[PDB]
Each structure stands twice: as C-alpha cells, then as structure tokens.
Amino acid sequence: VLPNPGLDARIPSLAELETIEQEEASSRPKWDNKAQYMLTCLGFCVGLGNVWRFPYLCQSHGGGAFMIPFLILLVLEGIPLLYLEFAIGQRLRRGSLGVWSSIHPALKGLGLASMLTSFMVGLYYNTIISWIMWYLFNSFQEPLPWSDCPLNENQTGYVDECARSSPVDYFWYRETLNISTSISDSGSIQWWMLLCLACAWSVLYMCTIRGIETTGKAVYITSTLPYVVLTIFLIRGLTLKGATNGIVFLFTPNVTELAQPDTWLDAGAQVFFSFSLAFGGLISFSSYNSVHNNCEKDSVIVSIINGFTSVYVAIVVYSVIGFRATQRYDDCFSTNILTLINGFDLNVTQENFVDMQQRCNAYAQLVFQTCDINAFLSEAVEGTGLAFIVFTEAITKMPLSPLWSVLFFIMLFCLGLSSMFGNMEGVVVPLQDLRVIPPKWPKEVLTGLICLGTFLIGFIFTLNSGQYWLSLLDSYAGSIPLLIIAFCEMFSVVYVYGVDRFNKDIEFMIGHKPNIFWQVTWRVVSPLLMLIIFLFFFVVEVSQELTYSIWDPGYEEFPKSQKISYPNWVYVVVVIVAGVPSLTIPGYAIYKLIR
C-alpha cells in the first residue's frame, strides 16, 4: 500500500513456487511428518507460555481477572498473528530474517530484533531449566530436601533463617540460590548451580545438533509428556481437600483488577508468549512445509489447543493453591483453638469458636491470629515461587511426595526444553542467513558455538545476585520488544507487502481468500489492540518506581517482603535489554535509507 518498488525479483513468484518444491529436496530441510511439525509448534507454544509465565500471572492477578483479558486477546490479537506468521513463512520459503528482507530491504531490523529477543529470552529461560533440573535431581529422597529445616551447629535448635521463614523458603533462597541481599552484592559462581547450567545447555545441544531433523524426533516425548503428566496432576489435584474451593476461586473473578492497565498489559504480553509470536522460530518452521499445505487450518488447531491448555493449566494450578490455602486455614483455626484450650484448660470445633471464646472471657493474655480462607487464596507468590515454594510444599503433604516431585519437574523440564527448541531456531537460522560462519562448517559447529557462547553468558545467573538478574532481564525481555516486533510483522505484511497481494498468495496455497474475520482482525482490530497494549506499557512504567524484592534475613521482618530500589547503574542494563532490540527496527531502517 506504501511505496515498495521492485518487490518481485526479491520474492519467489507464485508461478515458480510449484517448480521450487521438487527441486529443493536438497539444501533446505523437510518435516518427516505433518504431525512432527504440529508437535514442534505446539511444544514451542505450550512450553514458552506454561513452563512459567502463564501459571505465574494467573496466580499473580487472582485467576479469572487474568484469564478473561487473556482469552479475549488470544482470539483478537493471537489467532490473527499466528495465521499471518504460518502463511508468510510458507509463501516466502525463508526464515524470519529472510521474510522481512524479501518483503522490504530496509525492513531488516524486524528479523534482527526477532533474533536478539529470541537469544535474550532463551539465555535466562535455560537458567530456569537449570533451576528446574536442580529440583529434579534433588527429587529422589523419601524426605524431600525442602520438607524439613536444617539444625544448628549445636543441633539444639533449627537454623534461624529456616525458622523465621519455611523449609521450602530456605531450600530456595539458601540451599539452592544462596541468594545475596542485593544485585550489587554479587558473590562467586555457585558451583552446584553451574553443574545444572552445564547440564541444561548440554541436553539442548544434544537435541538441536543438526536442527529440525534431530529436534523433530525430540518433540515426540517432549511435546506429549507435559500433557500426560498435566492430566495425572488434575486427577490428583481435584482429590486434594482444598481443590474445588480454589477452582471456585478462579471462576469468581476480581473486576477491580479488570479495570487496571497492569492486568491488560500482562495479559497482552502473555499472548505473544503463549503463541511464540515475534520470536520468529514459527516462520522458519512453516517455511519447511509444502507450498500447498493448509496453513489456515494448522493455525486454528494450534490456537484451539493453546487456549484449552491455558484453562487446563489454570485448573491444575488453582486445585493446588486451594488445597494449600485450606491447609493454612485449618492449621490457623487449629492454633486459634490450641491457644484458648491452653489458657482455660477445656470440646472446641471450627464451628463453636466465636461463642466459645465469648463465654470463656486471662482472655486478654491470649492472642488469636485472625484468619479466613479468602486471604489464604489471595496470597500471591512472586517470581518462580509457584513451582519452588507452592507446588514443592503441597507435594510434601501428598503421599508419594517423591513421585509427585519427579513427575512435576520432568513435565516442567519437557515444557522448558520444547520452548528452547523454538528459541534455538530463532537465533541459529538468522545466523545461517547472515552467513556469520564459513559455509564449509557443518550445522553441529554453529549450533555448538551458540550452545557454548550463551552457556558462558549464563554464569551471571550462577552468582549469589544471579536471581535478581533473571528477574529484571525477564521484566524487560518479553515486554515492549515482543509488542513492537509483533505489531511491525502485522503492519509490514498488510501495509508494506499489501494484504491484497497476501490474500492472492494464500488463495494459491489453500484455494480460498480468508474469511472477513481475518480481514477485520488483520486490517484494523489487531494493530489497534497492539497499539493500546503498547501505550499501557508506558502508562504502568511512569507511576511505578524501579524496585525489586530482596531476601534479607537480618531484615527486621525477614519473612515479610523488602522492596528496595535498584541502583542507578541498572538503567544501563534496562536501556539495552529492551531498547537495543526495539530500536534495531527504526535503527536499520534509517541506516538503509542513508546507504
């Protein structure tokens, strides 16, 4: 629609596309099955959303208050851009970097930014896989190592930190992290954390050695186990006492939060995470299909499973939250009961309490810790705590705790590993297009150079301050960069390449111009939605102050949270993690208009 002079003789002609399939058997890789491609897309979509981010924000926003805005934006901004990406990859027979180069020469920043974002998110997501496998390794003991507290040197009392907090909190912050008080205080490379990091990047190399060939045979177990195990955790989930109390809690959504731009922003950025959009590893994966494959039907199947697994994950999460909250509620009423009995020597139930204490009333000397199930259900764990603090504790109060531990951390590994496969494709392929290495070198080399270079960069997260880094990195890695990239893909396919051209080629491939649904979502609605969520980013950034949670035991309220402001140097780390990728799109565009 805008000036794009010389678009042919930069893009395969539709007349040539029939003649470019049978000849290109060599020099470009091929999916063994249709299923082996659909698994690799689902794996990259279900593993990059549900390995961590999705289950967190659901519990961090109360559930329905996040799920509602999510499923609205999954259909209006998700489905369109997932269809667009599958279609444009299958037509231009290039990965993400080739597609935006062919469409327009100065549109290189898009493909580059997609490679930077894919690199950045995969860097700290393999640390989370390292953390996951640490727990997995520590999950083969009748007493789970986080089930009890360590003793003093005298062994006359439990460790102070572990007493003020919980065995679970201690295993996370001390036994695993050995966390320091601030991002400033950065100690040595925690050795046991480095072994797990090595183990993570290594198994990644083992599965992405020759590329889609070797990964295609990995995604059978990796894309299927998370499911089989997620269903086992539903049957066990719903047998837990507090489940169907917490399930009911996600279905009764907070509306006050529905009026916050924060809830909509986090729901927005999660659509681009749950659909693996603007990472550009899906474009590359659709670029190995037949030119006449139904890429409209694949997008709808993948999206329907992605929307269904979100709800199926929120159910398995709120089962356990409910169970936990019931446990804490009962253990509180029991204590409130013990105090009265131990001060009056009484015969007291969860029912005859308010009358009981009333008639009983020394009463002043007694202290009763007020508590209701609602407050327990509302408790939000921050960070990675839903796996390492909420699930890991609930597992210890479930018989076959060790099984429940190994099943849960294998399904989180699988989910994280299948996410890494698509993140590896969004950095490896754009390098092969740039011809960074000499062509003679095999695939194993480039892959290995990338597997070792990042593994070295992953040492920042094995420090004592290592957890704060992964926190802020994520905060600015999957935010604006994805929003911007995702908006520019929608804009550059419809207003630069022409939606009308885009409608004719799809018609070549599937035999029909897409439904008016697609037309309205692609021309007007999705770009407008992506603009509203792009402002909401700056609306929530201004009012909030740059801060973060620290785990200082010496802190007066050590158990209570401690939100300190980041140092003034951190804005150097923020301006690069978010600005560098987001500015490569204008930056290269300007550079190409002056060359």
Partner: peptide, 30 residues
C-alpha cells in the same frame, strides 16, 4: 554421598554418550 550428584552423574553421562553418538552418526553420513 549427595543423591542429586549421583542423579546428575547418570544424566550428564547419558547426555555425553548421545552427543558423541550424534557427532559420529553425522560424520558417518557421507
């Protein structure tokens, strides 16, 4: 004896085996 170390030892060993096997398998491809 740390059970995590034994578990790691096994897993890290198994991965290496795969890795070398894959390298030679590709080299074998001629």
């Amino acid at each position: 004896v740390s059970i995590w170390l034994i578990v790691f030892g096994v897993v890290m060993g198994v991965i290496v085996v795969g890795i070398v096997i894959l390298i030679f398998t590709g080299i074998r491809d001629r």
